[PDB]
RNA sequence: UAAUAAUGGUAUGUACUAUGAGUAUGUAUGUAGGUUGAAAACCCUACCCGCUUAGGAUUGCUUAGCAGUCCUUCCCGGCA
């Protein structure tokens, strides 16, 4: 069988982001906003959140744990192709010292 | 019906176990067949005029027996005959449709019973999301240990 | 007309996995260093 | 919009606000000014205390008691006191948000709220390279 | 490409969907469309140690 | 571009941070949890008390940022104590930024640091309309 | 019903200190009674709440998957 698996450790920041510039001069979630250039986002914080996404994706790997987000926000994704392969049970061998 | 008992149900529940078991209902499957007419041949025919007032007076003004369609003209379909029909001598018999018995119908259905892999995967993912939430919450415990 | 109900197991031999299996991420976790409390056990046993 | 809170007790030292809709929630901001001489020059010292207390009833156990009865209300308190000289508020402002950013990683983002620390945290000082 | 929701919360100032990385400017998690991702075709099989 | 610090004292209760470049500044976090039944029902109260102190000598006489003129140091200590039910931590978090802005309005953007007080300052609560 | 007390505790506020939540203090010790004294009421009764003991509940039922409980006993704790 074949298994669609997410592939972390192979990402890059393409720079297609568009930060929004709030005309309200505060953290107001309303009012007007302007699309701004991506040059404003700090490199260090960008790298920090990128590594956070990296570790989260690596943790959510080969798990079939989450699915694709309703809004499109992906997660650690694993799509089954056909029937999934059966997983052998974790066997146990025990000995008692007399 | 094929019911299965789990033994000491309440005792296991108090122990803290979740229980599942296959089950069947006392369902019923019925097959009903209704016979019909089977036309095989025909030859004799005749033309009837008689009356053509089967339809109602939709689109006409009713004034007694007068069916007014215009302000100056009307008709009485009791006597206004202008449609000619044909009537034949059909030869027909009773044909009885047949169908498979509910026994083999249910046999085929139970053979075709197959779980939905897509639903299974979706429900597993739904559970695993909150499973991951709790695992991430609890991850720090063994460090304190 | 067909009307009946059935309930079926998830045949855990074949299905029933496909989950996180919380054994992992905890077995690969501190199980070794937590076991390494043999140091403290030896310390207390020495004075015992 | 969040409901405005109005004062109940005003004083030259303590101002206590409360919500008209529910006055149980309070925000008492006390001040305490003293004279401190260190570098052969008197400096203006302000000990600004801020206490924000909110009250939210119960953790609301499921079922059983969910008809017309509420388990007694709990207390949620956050206390903050700010010290330092008043001649250098500019740096006091800078460190305050730094303290705000510092506390967020432990509390807002980290699991310090549930009671567990994180020695591998990433905190920074007020000063900058 | 997709976005980078659930990235982080510290430092960012959250205003509904808006996440303010600064006092005035802000970014949005599902609009952060600047990441290039690899997803590959995998054939897998359980092994018994 | 902000210089981070690293832990000094590690304990199951207290973690002490401090800058290697400047050992004067430090940030420590200790927290105590208590097993409480307030309304004859159990509660998870965690009291995280946070201190951030910076010894910044900044009298800096007028226009005298000129030469080797050292000033004696002065204290700037910030004490925060957050206590509440762990079960209601999510809304306890929600109350927390309300404390942020409330302090920020009257002090950071207001003029409470100098020791003044404005009862008319906009003070708002956690809940919304 | 109960007194001598060791009343080393806890929680909540006060003043000092604080690169500390340390110092000292007031208050109260789940809910009401009896009781001198050490009135921070020691202790017994009654009622609630949370532990513990080992027994049970229709243990099966279900055209849906239940159910995360209930009762008694041992049972120690919610001021000493």
mmCIF file of N, CA and C in Angstrom, chain D residues 38-41 43 88, chain F residues 22 55-62 64-74:
data_model
loop_
_atom_site.group_PDB
_atom_site.id
_atom_site.type_symbol
_atom_site.label_atom_id
_atom_site.label_comp_id
_atom_site.label_asym_id
_atom_site.label_seq_id
_atom_site.Cartn_x
_atom_site.Cartn_y
_atom_site.Cartn_z
ATOM 1 N N UNK D 38 20.149 58.808 47.146
ATOM 2 C CA UNK D 38 21.227 57.857 46.908
ATOM 3 C C UNK D 38 22.492 58.562 46.423
ATOM 4 N N UNK D 39 22.436 59.170 45.244
ATOM 5 C CA UNK D 39 23.603 59.804 44.671
ATOM 6 C C UNK D 39 23.720 61.276 44.989
ATOM 7 N N UNK D 40 23.880 61.603 46.276
ATOM 8 C CA UNK D 40 23.891 62.968 46.810
ATOM 9 C C UNK D 40 22.873 63.840 46.084
ATOM 10 N N UNK D 41 21.759 63.233 45.674
ATOM 11 C CA UNK D 41 20.715 63.934 44.934
ATOM 12 C C UNK D 41 19.407 63.200 45.182
ATOM 13 N N UNK D 43 15.837 61.730 44.749
ATOM 14 C CA UNK D 43 15.156 61.189 43.585
ATOM 15 C C UNK D 43 13.708 60.878 43.933
ATOM 16 N N UNK D 88 13.227 58.537 35.573
ATOM 17 C CA UNK D 88 13.535 57.663 34.452
ATOM 18 C C UNK D 88 12.364 56.743 34.136
ATOM 19 N N UNK F 22 25.227 41.270 32.041
ATOM 20 C CA UNK F 22 24.955 42.187 33.147
ATOM 21 C C UNK F 22 24.245 41.381 34.228
ATOM 22 N N UNK F 55 18.864 46.946 37.993
ATOM 23 C CA UNK F 55 19.625 48.008 38.640
ATOM 24 C C UNK F 55 20.175 48.909 37.543
ATOM 25 N N UNK F 56 19.442 49.975 37.241
ATOM 26 C CA UNK F 56 19.824 50.894 36.177
ATOM 27 C C UNK F 56 20.210 52.240 36.761
ATOM 28 N N UNK F 57 21.493 52.593 36.796
ATOM 29 C CA UNK F 57 21.870 53.936 37.248
ATOM 30 C C UNK F 57 21.610 54.951 36.144
ATOM 31 N N UNK F 58 20.554 55.737 36.311
ATOM 32 C CA UNK F 58 20.247 56.738 35.298
ATOM 33 C C UNK F 58 19.764 58.061 35.884
ATOM 34 N N UNK F 59 20.501 58.688 36.809
ATOM 35 C CA UNK F 59 20.198 60.086 37.125
ATOM 36 C C UNK F 59 20.517 60.962 35.929
ATOM 37 N N UNK F 60 21.733 60.796 35.407
ATOM 38 C CA UNK F 60 22.220 61.421 34.184
ATOM 39 C C UNK F 60 21.933 62.915 34.157
ATOM 40 N N UNK F 61 22.682 63.717 34.916
ATOM 41 C CA UNK F 61 22.474 65.173 34.920
ATOM 42 C C UNK F 61 22.335 65.778 33.531
ATOM 43 N N UNK F 62 21.612 66.897 33.447
ATOM 44 C CA UNK F 62 21.181 67.471 32.177
ATOM 45 C C UNK F 62 22.340 67.674 31.208
ATOM 46 N N UNK F 64 24.711 65.897 30.215
ATOM 47 C CA UNK F 64 26.022 65.505 30.732
ATOM 48 C C UNK F 64 26.383 64.085 30.319
ATOM 49 N N UNK F 65 25.796 63.611 29.224
ATOM 50 C CA UNK F 65 26.204 62.345 28.626
ATOM 51 C C UNK F 65 27.494 62.593 27.857
ATOM 52 N N UNK F 66 28.578 62.847 28.586
ATOM 53 C CA UNK F 66 29.769 63.408 27.966
ATOM 54 C C UNK F 66 31.001 62.530 28.140
ATOM 55 N N UNK F 67 31.252 62.068 29.364
ATOM 56 C CA UNK F 67 32.522 61.416 29.659
ATOM 57 C C UNK F 67 32.392 60.351 30.740
ATOM 58 N N UNK F 68 33.525 59.972 31.332
ATOM 59 C CA UNK F 68 33.564 58.955 32.381
ATOM 60 C C UNK F 68 32.998 59.563 33.659
ATOM 61 N N UNK F 69 31.676 59.687 33.688
ATOM 62 C CA UNK F 69 30.985 60.220 34.855
ATOM 63 C C UNK F 69 30.007 59.171 35.367
ATOM 64 N N UNK F 70 30.473 58.328 36.288
ATOM 65 C CA UNK F 70 29.643 57.227 36.749
ATOM 66 C C UNK F 70 28.667 57.724 37.803
ATOM 67 N N UNK F 71 27.462 57.176 37.774
ATOM 68 C CA UNK F 71 26.417 57.467 38.736
ATOM 69 C C UNK F 71 26.140 56.237 39.586
ATOM 70 N N UNK F 72 25.772 56.418 40.847
ATOM 71 C CA UNK F 72 25.376 55.273 41.668
ATOM 72 C C UNK F 72 24.078 54.668 41.162
ATOM 73 N N UNK F 73 23.920 53.380 41.434
ATOM 74 C CA UNK F 73 22.816 52.627 40.869
ATOM 75 C C UNK F 73 21.559 52.756 41.717
ATOM 76 N N UNK F 74 20.414 52.598 41.059
ATOM 77 C CA UNK F 74 19.113 52.668 41.704
ATOM 78 C C UNK F 74 18.263 51.487 41.263
#
